[PDB]
Amino acid sequence: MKANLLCGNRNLPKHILVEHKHEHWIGIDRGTLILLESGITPQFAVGDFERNFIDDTDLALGIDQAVKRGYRNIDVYGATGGRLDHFMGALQILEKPEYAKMNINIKLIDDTNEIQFIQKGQFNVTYSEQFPYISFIPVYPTVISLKGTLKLGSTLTISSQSCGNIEGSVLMIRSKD
Amino acid sequence: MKANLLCGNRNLPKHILVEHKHEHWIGIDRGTLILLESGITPQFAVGDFDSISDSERNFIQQQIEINPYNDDTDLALGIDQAVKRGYRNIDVYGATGGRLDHFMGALQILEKPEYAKMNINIKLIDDTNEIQFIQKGQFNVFPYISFIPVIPTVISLKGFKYNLQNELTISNELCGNIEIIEGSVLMIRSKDE
Amino acid sequence: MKANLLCGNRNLPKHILVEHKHEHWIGIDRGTLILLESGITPQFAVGDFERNFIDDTDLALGIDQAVKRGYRNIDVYGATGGRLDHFMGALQILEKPEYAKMNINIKLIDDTNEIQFIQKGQFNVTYSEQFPYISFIPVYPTVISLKGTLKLGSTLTISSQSCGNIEGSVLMIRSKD
Amino acid sequence: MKANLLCGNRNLPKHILVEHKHEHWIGIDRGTLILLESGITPQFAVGDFDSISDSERNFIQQQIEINPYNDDTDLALGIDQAVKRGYRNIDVYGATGGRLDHFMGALQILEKPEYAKMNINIKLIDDTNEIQFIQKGQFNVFPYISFIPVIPTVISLKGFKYNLQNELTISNELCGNIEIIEGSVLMIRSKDE
Amino acid sequence: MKANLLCGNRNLPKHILVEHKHEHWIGIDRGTLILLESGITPQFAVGDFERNFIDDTDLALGIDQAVKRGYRNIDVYGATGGRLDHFMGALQILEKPEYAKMNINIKLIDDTNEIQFIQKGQFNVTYSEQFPYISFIPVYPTVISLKGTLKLGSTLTISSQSCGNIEGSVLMIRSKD
Amino acid sequence: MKANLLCGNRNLPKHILVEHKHEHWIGIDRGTLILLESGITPQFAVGDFDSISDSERNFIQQQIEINPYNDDTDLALGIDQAVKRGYRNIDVYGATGGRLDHFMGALQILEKPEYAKMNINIKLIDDTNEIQFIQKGQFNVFPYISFIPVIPTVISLKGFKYNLQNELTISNELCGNIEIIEGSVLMIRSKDE
Ligand code: NA
Numbered sequence A, C, E: 001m002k003a004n005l006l007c008g009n010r011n012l013p014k015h016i017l018v019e020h021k022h023e024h025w026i027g028i029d030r031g032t033l034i035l036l037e038s039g040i041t042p043q044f045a046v047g048d049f050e051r052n053f054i055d056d057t058d059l060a061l062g063i064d065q066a067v068k069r070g071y072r073n074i075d076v077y078g079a080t081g082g083r084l085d086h087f088m089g090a091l092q093i094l095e096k097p098e099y100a101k102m103n104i105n106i107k108l109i110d111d112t113n114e115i116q117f118i119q120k121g122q123f124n125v126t127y128s129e130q131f132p133y134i135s136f137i138p139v140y141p142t143v144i145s146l147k148g149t150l151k152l153g154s155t156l157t158i159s160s161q162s163c164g165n166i167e168g169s170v171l172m173i174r175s176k177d
Numbered sequence B, D, F: 001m002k003a004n005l006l007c008g009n010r011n012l013p014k015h016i017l018v019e020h021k022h023e024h025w026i027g028i029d030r031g032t033l034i035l036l037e038s039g040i041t042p043q044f045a046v047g048d049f050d051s052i053s054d055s056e057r058n059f060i061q062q063q064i065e066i067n068p069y070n071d072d073t074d075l076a077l078g079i080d081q082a083v084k085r086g087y088r089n090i091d092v093y094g095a096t097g098g099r100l101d102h103f104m105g106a107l108q109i110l111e112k113p114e115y116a117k118m119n120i121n122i123k124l125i126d127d128t129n130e131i132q133f134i135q136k137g138q139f140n141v142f143p144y145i146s147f148i149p150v151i152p153t154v155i156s157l158k159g160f161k162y163n164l165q166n167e168l169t170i171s172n173e174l175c176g177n178i179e180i181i182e183g184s185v186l187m188i189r190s191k192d193e
């Protein structure tokens, strides 16, 4: 089951709320209000502006509840822009070791990016129409692909499928040109 | 048709918002924002409720906020407004604890005669109690049960004695009969804490 | 809360029923049938072709019930055209002294007009894109604006904001050119 | 699944259309137009019902009007048609007053054996009464209660005597037991007017 | 009342599921799944991939239940293409003598045809915009129109209204050019 | 909030899918496909369930199929997953007949202590029975009733004797009282076949 979380209205892909109006949506803080104003009933909501559902941030809470509720595909919207600590809080979540063993998939999506946390191992990467660039950001991580503090463009802006093997852990970022 | 009113977040039965998320909910004052925050759309709301942006207030004050003309408390209007829409069973949550002058006002509403003649069922509910008004007449049936007079002769059966008992049974424990020969009494059911 | 009343299908603004399909609608007489045929469930309906809700016309009844139900913004559609006594009955409503004290706002809207009853006092008037003309029709009413039985074009076809003060009462009509 | 049928506007419990506006409603003859007029969309309707324009009749006779093949009265078809869709609890309103030959036909339906074997619950209801058929067997439980035989031995408890009483109790007043040893009886509950 | 049956996804008129999303739909076998995937709740469904509703094929069952439920206008979609025995099974249904006496109307519709079983008697035929051709296929049937094993183009591809009288029984087929 | 679970098609009460077509349904293993086939959309489903095309599996495994992390049987996860969403009354259908080791596992779930403290009501149901767990305490109330101990002193009233009866009443026939002084018992109601 796929879960769509909305925790803001900044940088949202176009028509995301109308093209996906009948999917499972979850409100996070202010995202809840936006969903209601768009005629969408949230499966559940978290954060003020909730607590009786069932140390942590509202988004960490909402995602944890999604995971516990069996969702395997979790896409987070409205988590980039404005206050950046909120965006960093999101990246933290993706890193929780608890979501490592599980066969879960969480990603932050905005009108220009798609962020995922690729852990130690080997994964495949299919091409995409709107997302030409790919970049890996270590969270010592050594990697091997089909073309090969640290601040190098070595594993940044780069363009079937390919293999990505990590001999630590990184954040995979796909972005539009 | 059943309506649930939320007046705030004190002594609320745990999980009451998740367990009845699809029923009809009415927001009274602070209850309004708690409903929305839980992703619940109130059929309507009464109360000055705070806003954080025009986009919001515009939303709430056009599809949720009603403005009954009145005098009466926000809860009393919410009730009347629910009865006007055909709601027959009303459960008020969030009306206990804190400032007791309000809890008391909530009791005045249950006692309004305008509801006795009608076939309305109003109950105040929190995590430990259930309260309702019972007028002159005969009726049947939280291990504890108590009757408090409002304005009263009473006769009970399955509980204990009480025969033509004038107004004790301020904590009974019992498919049961109770007849109000005269006056009126509030019935309050409690759980064993 | 805003209430939308439908008591006919003549002169309705374009796409009013599809662009506003999720707002609060009230049926009045035949308007009820039109709403049902458009997939809209009326909050309530009045008039035959209802009475157990809760001397007067069906529309006076429906609007009175709206007012009693706390609606502050009431827009009436389908009240112009065809039988004119029905349109005049509508204008009567706007005039009820009962809706004077209250902070209510009622208006008749059709594809070309927007009629409101401005009572004794002083009100403001914002400009509008589709409605360039403004006209005041007394219901002895003396007025003072930003440009200044009786049948004069003095207070008729006339084009930020402006002040309208009434030293009796009039009907304000905004119409498209 | 519960279905309410409207056969007309006589002796209807006050506010029955507002108070149950969201339940499933079926229109029988004139009931059809009363439902719609109240802004209620019938799940389906039986009956020649009048029209005032093709636009309307087209609407009603394509999304509301069904045409069961039959013989049986319009109400009897409406019932069968509700049972075919899985409705187990049926409340018929509007079937009392006026021409009594119809009220009687409505009683014949409750007595159809085709419903005894099934687990259907059909009740006729108006502002003062509630009526249902009770077949051979034992069952339990408007201050007044009366039993009228249809084709009958009976035994009651909480009411009064009645022990192996052959077919009086045409106005009882009483969490109660009743056993039909033989035959069948209509049970009618009334209120104190 | 009109009933729409869906028992497949081959040769469906364009946008049938979106333009008619709010009408009464019935699922038949796989049609059920297609309806659910299109956001449509079937009044009821028949066939595996149901039986406790209330010798025969799932479509014969679904249509019989429609007829018993009082539907007078029954349009069948997705019954042409792929396995042809399934299409022939459909034609059989249209022929059931049981649906002769009744004032019922059943037809198979696809993006190019509209098939109906005209029995012994006399019927009228209105023109249509998208369907210019008409053809009659006997199911000894003698006919008389406004222009007049057997394998003749005499009563095939042929183009107000007209009269069609049958002095046995035939299948009327209207098709696009 | 009420949830119905379907685990398969054995001993199902006839018409259970048509009569409750609009309630909330959860699919467990084979129950999933039976729900869909009947044109019913499950709130969610647990179980490897078969597919016949990617289009389908994609559909089911994105809007219906959930994957709780676990160990526990598919039915036990379905239950927990329903309780997590706020479902308080759970009716499990399709869990009897066939391989009894499963029927037994279904009984273990009703006995989980994690549900005793909470205010959840889980019942196993088929065309002839209704089964539920009853913990230490006092409670009230298919002509046949039986109590089977799980881990037990008991006292019944309206049925027959049973006073401080230690753990017979493996087929009672009776607005009734039962108190578990010690231990726990499964209550099973049966119909007369
Ligand atoms: Na959920």
Ligand code: NA
Pocket: B089, B090, B091, B121, B122, B123
């Ligand atoms: Na109540």
Ligand code: NA
Pocket: B011, B096, B097, B098
């Ligand atoms: Na307190």
Ligand code: NA
Pocket: B085, C043, C044, C069
């Ligand atoms: Na309303």
Ligand code: NA
Pocket: D089, D090, D091, D121, D122, D123
């Ligand atoms: Na009933």
Ligand code: NA
Pocket: D011, D096, D097, D098
């Ligand atoms: Na009468």
Ligand code: NA
Pocket: D085, E043, E044, E069
């Ligand atoms: Na149907």
Ligand code: NA
Pocket: F089, F090, F091, F121, F122, F123
């Ligand atoms: Na249960």
Ligand code: NA
Pocket: F011, F096, F097, F098
């Ligand atoms: Na068995």
